[PDB]
Design an enzyme around this catalytic site. Sequence first.
Site, short mmCIF file in Angstrom:
data_model
loop_
_atom_site.label_atom_id
_atom_site.label_comp_id
_atom_site.label_asym_id
_atom_site.label_seq_id
_atom_site.Cartn_x
_atom_site.Cartn_y
_atom_site.Cartn_z
N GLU A 116 -5.43 -30.60 6.65
CA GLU A 116 -4.93 -29.52 7.48
C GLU A 116 -5.73 -29.33 8.79
O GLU A 116 -5.18 -28.79 9.75
CB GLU A 116 -4.93 -28.22 6.67
CG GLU A 116 -3.95 -28.20 5.51
CD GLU A 116 -2.47 -28.22 5.86
OE1 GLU A 116 -2.12 -28.48 7.04
OE2 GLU A 116 -1.65 -28.03 4.94
N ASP A 136 2.60 -26.62 14.28
CA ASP A 136 2.75 -27.55 13.16
C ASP A 136 3.40 -28.86 13.59
O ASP A 136 3.69 -29.07 14.77
CB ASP A 136 3.67 -26.88 12.11
CG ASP A 136 3.04 -26.52 10.78
OD1 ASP A 136 1.79 -26.35 10.74
OD2 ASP A 136 3.79 -26.35 9.80
#
EC number: 3.2.1.17
Length: 442
Positions: free
Chosen positions: A212, A221
């Site tokens: 992440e 994202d």
Amino acid sequence: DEVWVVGMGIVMSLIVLAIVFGNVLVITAIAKFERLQTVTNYFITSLACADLVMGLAVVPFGAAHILMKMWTFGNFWCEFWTSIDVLCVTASIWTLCVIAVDRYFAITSPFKYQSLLTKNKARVIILMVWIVSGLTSFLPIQMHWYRATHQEAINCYAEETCCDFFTNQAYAIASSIVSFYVPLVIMVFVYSRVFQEAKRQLNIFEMLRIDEGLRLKIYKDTEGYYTIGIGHLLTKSPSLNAAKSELDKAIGRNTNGVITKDEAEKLFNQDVDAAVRGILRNAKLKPVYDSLDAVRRAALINMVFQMGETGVAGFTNSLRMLQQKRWDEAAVNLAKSRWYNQTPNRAKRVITTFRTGTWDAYKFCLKEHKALKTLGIIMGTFTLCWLPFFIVNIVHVIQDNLIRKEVYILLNWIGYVNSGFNPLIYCRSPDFRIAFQELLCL
Ligand SMILES: CC(C)CCC[C@@H](C)[C@H]1CC[C@H]2[C@@H]3CC=C4C[C@@H](O)CC[C@]4(C)[C@H]3CC[C@]12C
Ligand SMILES: Cc1ccc(OC[C@@H](O)[C@H](C)NC(C)C)c2c1CCC2
């Protein structure tokens, strides 16, 4: 011939220059940037000092000894030079052994990547290494305990122009073991455990910190959704204010789109906790989770963290084969998904973890693990450069007529050239990279 001597002269000058420039730079970088004033870098300073002393006080005199085919610096400088040479090697290998031990206690502590030593303690350790190794370097030479009793050696001692390192076998054996082999053996043994521990102690938190990433400001994202921290999805809404409100709500203060490392880790805990709770509340995921080992559970938690309980639950055929321990069969189905196409680098690491049941895919991915690898490279390269010389030296003791002077000198210069390598290896560290471009005004 003339061409060989001039050509040898140029190469040796570049080696002296590369060692000096490179090591002054390291010392300066640590001395000037507070972020680099760490216990580990204090030991690196000890190692760069040995390399600087090697480059300034040893290698130029050795070069002049080769080129001139004699010693024009007198008997006193000859014994003193040889002592400094030994000190630089002894101090270096003991400093590397200290690093290994320090890194071992660090990794086996709850602090994981920080030294248990304080900078004062570390300074006192460095001072102890240099005093002791200096005592074991200078005393046997000044006292003449090293001296060989054969005529070729005796003539060389009395001759002011001869500075050939003739030693008796007991000195060669004893000083080599204590000053080089013992710290080397401990370092390689201890540092292989440091590496073992970094892999063994890998968990879901480090796995997600890796996959992440970490960002203390709002970002987008792969799906272009507003995110912060360690993959904490803020909102699927395309409004930056919507993302900012949700953030202010989550943290419980006016964030203004920015959060602290304390806040980033806080959200992360909740997220990982929710992922596990979501698994245990899902009828389709819970039996798969129960059948998995510690490592594979983290791979499953990772998927739930990224896609959510419902998303993962859809991989009905993969989950079935994870339960049935049919890893390679599960791997194929998981590769034949939108998840794999969307995030191939992450999916391949997760799929690999499911196949192997190991952390090999997450090997040297964490920045702290990358620092450990860098330190291992320093140790591995020092060993490679010095061990052939030390072996050949201790073989010259058992079998007197092994290989000639030119091979003995060559292998010593392999070791010498190592004093020039370490500054280039620190270029692996992003902190060191910035420090260098700053000091070099690049
Ligand atoms: C030929 C011999 C006598 C010269 C050896 C040079 C000596 C003076 C050098 C080599 C290594 C040096 C140390 C390298 C590491 C550190 C960490 C630094 O944060 C504080 C100083 C300290 C503790 C240095 C003090 C001076 C030191 C001991
Ligand atoms: C204890 C110890 C430490 C370092 C050693 O090698 C360094 C080597 O550059 C030698 C000194 N240089 C000659 C060309 C002078 C050696 C020992 C034992 C003998 C070899």
